[PDB]
Design a protein around this ligand. Structure first.
Ligand code: D0D
Ligand code: CL
Length: 326
């Protein structure tokens, strides 16, 4: 190739009849997300899936956007990023992915804030940095990293999702340059707000905000502040406050993610190293009341699988990460 390398990802087209036990997880204006089982024909496996569709097929912009999302999700393969299993070409286009049964990490940290210890928080920071370093290696800028877009496979294992705003940087390209559209201002780097510049280092800013969401057990960044004021606040040099549990070691890493010079911010590879060091002595880096005694569900637990799956299905249930095709 003269430009970037050829994208040889396989897009699997999935028959509607391979999907069973469809139940709504959530809805909005644009569309609906369901849980279900995918039973590829004659394989003897049942795969828990999330299924996303648009409500209607009457917005060229929306149809193009969901197929752009499918293109990005089909093109990724890393343990800390969610991959597309395939698409179903019903009246609506439907995107199919591995079910993450504990939901998004934002709601998880809110719902379980009294049972989340320092080891879980630092390990999640490592895992998100690994996922984002992989996306950087693939020249993807995510543009919507937030705790709402990190999903929980198990309490021990999280993955980045929601590639609806993601963009591929060309071979020698350094910055994406957008125009218009809905934007999550409270996670954006200042250069993204001012000048629509997006880079891996603008995702590092959003990672800093994501870590702040986790460390405050899912607090809203800049709560009560209107979106239109955020650029002015940031230009004055204001930033999100130090979370109560954070040592200066942890908070300084967040503050470095929010520096004006994007190239002075940490790289994702460095964030992996620093959070990994801290995860080896987590109580030196986060101060949580009662931390020593805390525990969360593990795949070893009796009703771990039974909580999700019906017992009628469980003999042939396979997690999609173990369902591998050539
Ligand atoms: C975007 C992404 N979403 C998922 N991918 C995988 N597993 C999911 C599992 C659950 C959920 C989930 C969805 N809505 C709500 Cl309201 C909740 N509730 S909670 C627990 O409070 O967060 C969980 C989403 C999932 C996807 C990409 C492509 C296709 C299909 C879904
Ligand atoms: Cl919220």
């Amino acid at each position: 190739a003269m430009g970037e390398a050829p994208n040889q990802a396989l897009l699997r087209i999935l028959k509607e009849t391979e999907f069973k036990k469809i139940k709504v997880l959530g809805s909005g204006a644009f569309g609906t997300v369901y849980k279900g089982l995918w039973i590829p024909e004659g394989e003897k496996v049942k795969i828990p899936v999330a299924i996303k569709e648009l409500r209607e097929a009457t917005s060229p912009k929306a149809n193009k956007e969901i197929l752009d999302e499918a293109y990005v999700m089909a093109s990724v393969d890393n343990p800390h990023v969610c991959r597309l299993l395939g698409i179903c070409l019903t009246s609506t286009v439907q995107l199919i992915t591995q079910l993450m049964p504990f939901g998004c990490l934002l709601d998880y940290v809110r719902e379980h804030k009294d049972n989340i210890g320092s080891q879980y928080l630092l390990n999640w920071c490592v895992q998100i940095a690994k996922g984002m370093n992989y996306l950087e290696d693939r020249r993807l800028v995510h543009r919507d990293l937030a705790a709402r877009n990190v999903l929980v496979k198990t309490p021990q294992h999280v993955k980045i999702t929601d590639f609806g705003l993601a963009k591929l940087l060309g071979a020698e390209e350094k910055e994406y340059h957008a125009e218009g559209g809905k934007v999550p201002i409270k996670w954006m780097a200042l250069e993204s707000i001012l000048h629509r510049i997006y880079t891996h280092q603008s995702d590092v800013w959003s990672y800093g905000v994501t870590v702040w969401e986790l460390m405050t057990f899912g607090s809203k960044p800049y709560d009560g502040i209107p979106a239109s004021e955020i650029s002015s606040i940031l230009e004055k040099g204001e930033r999100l406050p130090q979370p109560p549990i954070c040592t200066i070691d942890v908070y300084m890493i967040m503050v470095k993610c929010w520096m004006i010079d994007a190239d002075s911010r940490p790289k994702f590879r460095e964030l992996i190293i620093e959070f990994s060091k801290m995860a080896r002595d987590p109580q030196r880096y986060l101060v949580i009341q009662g931390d020593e005694r805390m525990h969360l569900p593990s795949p070893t637990d009796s009703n771990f699988y039974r909580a999700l799956m019906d017992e009628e299905d469980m003999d042939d249930v396979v997690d999609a990460d173990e369902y591998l095709i050539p």
